[PDB]
Symmetry: C4
């Protein structure tokens, strides 16, 4: 139900945040 | 309903973190 | 029980991530 | 069930994002 829907949405946002964090790490280390 | 409320809190803080990550990704390319 | 605890644990880690993201943002801004 | 499994997935991605955020702060601080 609703709690499963909300948990799938949080997992999608968490995977988006992790992809942006790896992009930021690339810029911080310059490669 | 108590677990759904904590999941909605988590989704809000995840959207806040994604917003800040986008602000960093912009700034860190000189945008 | 356990599902409420896992949700509380996620919320605490998300708050920690948000605090680190603000610190990273300040450096990215030049401060 | 599925809610517990997605919650444990979220908590593992959150801990990966916290680790990358601390790696980015280390690199930006020259630690």
């Amino acid at each position: 139900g609703e709690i499963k829907a909300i948990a799938q949405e949080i997992k999608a946002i968490a995977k988006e945040i992790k992809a942006i964090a790896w992009e930021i790490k690339a810029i911080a280390q310059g490669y």
